[PDB]
Amino acid sequence: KYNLADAHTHQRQSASQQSIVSRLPQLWYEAEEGLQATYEKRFTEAFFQLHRQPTALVKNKTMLSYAASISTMVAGMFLKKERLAVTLIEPCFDNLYDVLANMDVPLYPIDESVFYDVDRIYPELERRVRTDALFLVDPNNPTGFSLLRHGRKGFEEVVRFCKDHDKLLLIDFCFASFTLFEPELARFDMYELLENSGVRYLAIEDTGKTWPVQDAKCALITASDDIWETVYNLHTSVLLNVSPFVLNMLTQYVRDSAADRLASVREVLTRNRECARKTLDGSILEYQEPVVKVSVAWFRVDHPELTATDVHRLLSADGVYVLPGRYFYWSEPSKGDAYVRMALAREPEMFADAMALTRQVLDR
Amino acid sequence: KYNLADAHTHQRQSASQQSIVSRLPQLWYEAEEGLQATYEKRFTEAFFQLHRQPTALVKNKTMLSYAASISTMVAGMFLKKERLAVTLIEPCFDNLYDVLANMDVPLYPIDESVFYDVDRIYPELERRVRTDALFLVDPNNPTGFSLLRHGRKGFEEVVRFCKDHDKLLLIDFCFASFTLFEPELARFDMYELLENSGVRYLAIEDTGKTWPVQDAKCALITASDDIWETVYNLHTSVLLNVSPFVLNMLTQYVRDSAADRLASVREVLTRNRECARKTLDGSILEYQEPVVKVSVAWFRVDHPELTATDVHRLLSADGVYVLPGRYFYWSEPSKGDAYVRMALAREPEMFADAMALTRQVLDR
């Protein structure tokens, strides 16, 4: 009855978002009469204006695809062509591991904790990264961790390591919208740093996890200049273009959220996050406070005998579906037996009823 | 500027399709409140009812993705996991070659002419298919050729060969809509044959080339029972779901075309096909009549010196963009300098103006 598993957005539209919905027929006919490149440009401009990445608009080399996983498969084709193995963040949503493993990319974990202490990032990477590519997810799914806890310096140390040691840096920024307008955490211009450093890089951005667009979405990939041509040709074999109708619609959502400083996104997540925290405080599910207020909540199982598999089974029996941590510790899923993830992009009334039932199950 | 290059649909909405566009707000709220599985089921049912493939609905194992190229990349991941080489139809749109080559799938051509004589199909395949997999496109892009010119027997001979000789049979059916309601060519239930034969297969179907949905589309892939679980797991690493809003909208286009027996699609393509045929009769572009009335027209260059590359250069200098045949002879692009492809999925007024200009340029 209560799906708290997939992180996809299932909350309803805000009042101003209902006005976008009412304009869908005009957005359709506009895209029919206009030029594909016009809608690509207007979308990319609106997106990187909201995210405050002006360097990306100056370079104007970003490519659009149906979804972040499709951008990731383009990166996977590049990794295979260049015989690159990947050191990948753990924990991480395991579909990322799976799609790269299904492309036969060799994969080795690096634990998130190597990034907790800014002055240990570089020596820890020198000791632990023994592949020619490093794949990070920032802010991380499921933990909400971000190098932005360190200001600029955390990302600067990662980039310094990769440049010094001739590593390809891949970064999935799908959750970066949840840093925006934060006084201390708002993302700086990452593309300025990536370009200035000369590091080889692939950077993936997303709309699907931010807005309630029913997965009618677009992802963005940007490559360093030295691999841009190869990556462009890989990308064009996947698709010619994203729907200009979808691009037109998404541009309205981006502009709407610039106008309200992402309030309609943030307020829904905050309501459910606080309801989860208050309802489960003192329960066997121990809330793990995230660096960034992302759209998922992460819990440690605090019980002498019960594991995350048990909590998963017990909640499922009563109609509440969460995800056990084995789906995020992809290199040794046994490590995930102490954690559970819950989705927060939900209607607050259904979420609050799910939390009431969850606490009743956990108590029994 | 007259874009007759991309085969994507750019004709406008019919009177009844305008009533779908007008209801996009309602279709949005339906998908928002409803279950994802509902919109998957209703789309798949509408699609295979229109295409008259009842066996596919009985088996109920078809998976949905953003686009036919994404389904193809899932097939490519299977081909790479099994380390199989592919014998691929030639000519064919070279994006299919490109995406499989970019996944390092070994690719060897087989000319379309092996399928022209039904009584020679099996011995020609025995001689020429010396890989473990055979990949066909039927009806073919760019030629409109189809084994359906042989009724059931052409496909039955291909399937007999692949079963007898333990070949994986991959078929791209994206142009199959253009056979529907044809008195002699309408596709039979392909999945009845594929299932009954026990052949190992991957079958890809598409919406994007049929309807004017501005590339807000959905593709379908179906695998034989013996590889279904592997392919399912590969597919789920790519995406969890297609937008239920897009599925709901597409379902309305499918039902609309069931109601008019695809007249609003067929009549536009026929008008432009006839215009091209009449306009270019006797010119250096020699029309190649297709088996199936597909959305592209194919011409042979009839000149002692000029190539398709020359023709493309001359037409584009005056604003008419066609595709040289080099983009379809993927194993030997020079073979394609004898041919040109033109897109027909276009507003007829624009197309007729393009044709008048094309003949004016050619007559010089």
Side-chain angles (χ1 to χ4, degrees), chain A residues 2-32 34-40 42-51 53-126 128-183 185-276 279-304 306-313 315-325 327-331 333-334 336-359 361-363, chain B residues 2-40 42-51 53-183 185-239 241-348 350-359 361-364:
Chain A
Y2 302 100
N3 156 35
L4 310 182
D6 43 285
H8 295 211
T9 54
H10 290 282
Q11 69 267 40
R12 275 163 188 140
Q13 309 294 307
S14 77
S16 60
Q17 288 165 341
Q18 292 199 272
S19 172
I20 300 171
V21 174
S22 76
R23 286 191 288 124
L24 286 169
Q26 292 93 270
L27 299 171
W28 184 279
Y29 289 127
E30 286 167 18
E32 213 167 42
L35 293 178
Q36 172 72 208
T38 296
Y39 291 100
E40 293 169 349
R42 287 175 187 179
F43 168 74
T44 304
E45 281 169 359
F47 187 88
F48 284 130
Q49 283 170 15
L50 176 68
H51 280 266
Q53 309 295 305
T55 298
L57 297 174
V58 175
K59 297 294 291 186
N60 193 20
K61 61 182 168 165
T62 297
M63 297 287 279
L64 307 182
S65 76
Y66 306 119
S69 299
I70 308 308
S71 304
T72 300
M73 297 174 73
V74 172
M77 295 198 285
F78 181 79
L79 292 160
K80 290 293 291 301
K81 286 295 191 177
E82 301 295 326
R83 298 182 282 158
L84 306 175
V86 170
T87 298
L88 174 66
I89 186 66
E90 188 185 46
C92 83
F93 64 110
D94 70 0
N95 286 147
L96 178 51
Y97 167 77
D98 282 338
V99 78
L100 295 169
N102 285 340
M103 300 183 63
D104 288 325
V105 177
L107 290 149
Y108 306 86
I110 188 159
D111 191 74
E112 179 186 272
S113 61
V114 309
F115 304 105
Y116 290 170
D117 178 346
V118 71
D119 294 310
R120 294 221 32 72
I121 291 171
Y122 188 104
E124 283 297 306
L125 294 173
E126 282 201 319
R128 294 177 181 279
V129 178
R130 288 291 183 279
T131 58
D132 286 344
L134 174 67
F135 202 140
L136 307 182
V137 181
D138 195 295
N140 202 10
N141 179 353
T143 62
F145 176 76
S146 177
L147 290 159
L148 292 169
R149 144 202 280 201
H150 307 305
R152 304 179 65 93
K153 189 176 170 167
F155 274 112
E156 284 172 343
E157 285 294 272
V158 171
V159 172
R160 174 169 82 90
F161 168 76
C162 291
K163 179 60 183 315
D164 286 353
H165 291 85
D166 198 20
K167 313 292 198 194
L168 168 71
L169 178 55
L170 304 96
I171 307 171
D172 176 334
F173 291 117
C174 158
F175 274 4
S177 61
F178 303 121
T179 72
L180 300 174
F181 307 101
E182 281 276 3
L185 290 164
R187 69 193 304 214
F188 61 94
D189 182 350
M190 319 297 307
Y191 296 88
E192 179 175 24
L193 166 61
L194 294 168
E195 290 299 325
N196 283 350
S197 69
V199 74
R200 295 220 301 180
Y201 78 87
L202 290 166
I204 296 167
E205 308 260 356
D206 185 31
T207 54
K209 293 285 176 60
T210 301
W211 288 285
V213 295
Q214 308 204 66
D215 283 312
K217 60 193 165 188
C218 179
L220 305 87
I221 194 169
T222 309
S224 49
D225 282 350
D226 58 344
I227 70 177
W228 165 84
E229 186 177 2
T230 297
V231 173
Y232 179 93
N233 291 330
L234 295 173
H235 204 277
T236 63
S237 71
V238 176
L239 77 165
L240 175 69
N241 64 290
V242 175
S243 169
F245 165 61
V246 174
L247 292 178
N248 200 11
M249 182 201 70
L250 293 169
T251 301
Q252 310 315 306
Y253 278 89
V254 176
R255 287 173 180 167
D256 176 79
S257 286
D260 84 336
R261 295 168 68 84
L262 275 163
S264 70
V265 174
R266 294 186 285 100
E267 286 171 1
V268 166
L269 303 178
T270 290
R271 170 120 176 250
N272 295 339
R273 188 180 306 105
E274 293 310 311
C275 175
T279 304
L280 305 181
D281 180 45
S283 94
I284 70 174
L285 288 188
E286 181 188 272
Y287 180 73
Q288 307 295 290
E289 181 172 51
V291 172
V292 176
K293 304 173 322 152
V294 296
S295 62
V296 295
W298 187 233
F299 298 84
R300 193 185 66 87
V301 180
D302 186 14
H303 196 278
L306 294 179
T307 72
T309 300
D310 294 320
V311 169
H312 181 29
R313 162 190 60 90
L315 291 171
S316 188
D318 267 302
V320 166
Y321 293 72
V322 301
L323 284 176
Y327 298 122
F328 308 92
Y329 283 89
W330 50 266
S331 87
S334 89
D337 258 307
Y339 296 93
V340 152
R341 190 192 80 180
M342 307 190 338
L344 301 174
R346 294 303 190 267
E347 267 306 277
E349 290 299 307
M350 81 69 57
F351 190 90
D353 296 347
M355 289 303 98
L357 183 57
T358 290
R359 187 55 187 256
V361 173
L362 297 176
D363 284 338
Chain B
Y2 298 98
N3 169 9
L4 306 180
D6 325 310
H8 296 212
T9 50
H10 290 288
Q11 67 267 43
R12 292 316 196 268
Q13 304 303 304
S14 77
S16 59
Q17 287 162 342
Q18 287 165 223
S19 287
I20 305 172
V21 176
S22 291
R23 285 154 36 221
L24 287 172
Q26 164 213 148
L27 299 170
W28 183 278
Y29 291 129
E30 287 176 2
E32 189 164 67
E33 296 296 303
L35 299 174
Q36 174 72 27
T38 297
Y39 293 101
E40 293 168 347
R42 287 180 183 169
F43 168 75
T44 303
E45 284 174 357
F47 186 87
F48 285 131
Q49 283 167 14
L50 172 72
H51 279 265
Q53 312 292 305
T55 300
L57 294 174
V58 173
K59 295 295 290 190
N60 196 25
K61 55 178 177 173
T62 297
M63 304 197 67
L64 308 179
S65 80
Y66 309 116
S69 298
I70 308 310
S71 304
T72 300
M73 291 167 72
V74 173
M77 285 194 297
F78 182 80
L79 290 164
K80 284 301 286 311
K81 283 296 186 175
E82 295 266 270
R83 290 132 193 226
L84 307 179
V86 170
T87 300
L88 171 66
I89 182 67
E90 189 187 59
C92 81
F93 67 112
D94 71 357
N95 290 133
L96 176 52
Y97 169 78
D98 286 342
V99 78
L100 293 176
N102 283 340
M103 300 181 65
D104 295 313
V105 175
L107 292 154
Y108 297 86
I110 190 167
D111 193 72
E112 167 184 286
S113 67
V114 301
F115 303 107
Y116 291 170
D117 179 349
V118 73
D119 294 310
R120 294 300 300 165
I121 291 174
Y122 191 106
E124 288 293 337
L125 296 177
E126 182 146 30
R127 166 184 171 179
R128 298 178 188 277
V129 182
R130 305 191 296 277
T131 59
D132 290 308
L134 176 65
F135 202 140
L136 303 185
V137 179
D138 194 296
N140 200 11
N141 179 351
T143 65
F145 178 78
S146 175
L147 290 163
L148 297 167
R149 96 149 166 201
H150 306 305
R152 302 183 67 95
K153 187 176 168 169
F155 274 113
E156 282 168 346
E157 284 295 276
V158 169
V159 167
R160 179 168 78 91
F161 171 76
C162 291
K163 184 60 184 313
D164 284 352
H165 293 269
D166 188 39
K167 311 295 184 195
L168 167 67
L169 176 58
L170 306 96
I171 304 169
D172 177 334
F173 290 119
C174 294
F175 274 4
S177 61
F178 304 120
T179 74
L180 297 181
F181 307 102
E182 281 272 4
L185 289 165
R187 66 193 306 213
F188 60 93
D189 184 347
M190 311 303 160
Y191 298 85
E192 178 171 27
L193 169 60
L194 293 164
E195 291 296 325
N196 282 352
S197 71
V199 76
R200 294 207 138 188
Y201 77 86
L202 289 167
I204 297 171
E205 308 261 354
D206 183 34
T207 54
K209 293 285 173 60
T210 303
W211 289 284
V213 295
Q214 309 202 67
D215 290 315
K217 57 196 165 183
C218 183
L220 307 88
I221 192 168
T222 308
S224 52
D225 283 349
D226 58 347
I227 66 176
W228 164 83
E229 183 176 350
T230 298
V231 173
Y232 178 90
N233 287 334
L234 296 170
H235 203 280
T236 63
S237 74
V238 176
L239 78 163
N241 64 285
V242 175
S243 170
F245 167 61
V246 169
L247 292 176
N248 198 18
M249 179 197 63
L250 289 172
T251 303
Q252 309 324 127
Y253 279 85
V254 175
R255 292 174 180 168
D256 177 75
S257 289
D260 81 338
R261 295 169 63 85
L262 273 165
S264 69
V265 171
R266 295 185 288 98
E267 290 179 354
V268 163
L269 301 179
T270 291
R271 192 162 155 196
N272 295 342
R273 185 178 311 103
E274 279 306 293
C275 181
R277 193 189 57 76
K278 295 182 175 178
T279 292
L280 301 168
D281 179 37
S283 78
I284 64 166
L285 296 187
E286 169 191 288
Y287 180 68
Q288 305 298 116
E289 188 193 348
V291 173
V292 178
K293 308 165 166 144
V294 297
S295 59
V296 295
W298 186 237
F299 301 83
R300 191 181 69 86
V301 179
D302 183 9
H303 194 274
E305 287 96 39
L306 288 176
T307 66
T309 295
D310 296 324
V311 171
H312 166 274
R313 181 189 70 248
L314 291 164
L315 287 173
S316 60
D318 272 280
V320 176
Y321 291 85
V322 297
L323 286 183
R326 296 181 60 92
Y327 292 111
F328 305 88
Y329 281 90
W330 50 266
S331 75
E332 191 177 333
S334 51
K335 281 196 174 177
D337 258 322
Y339 301 90
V340 165
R341 196 193 76 175
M342 303 187 348
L344 303 174
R346 293 295 190 275
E347 277 298 275
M350 175 280 300
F351 191 89
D353 289 347
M355 284 305 99
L357 189 46
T358 294
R359 190 61 196 251
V361 173
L362 292 180
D363 286 348
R364 298 183 207 144

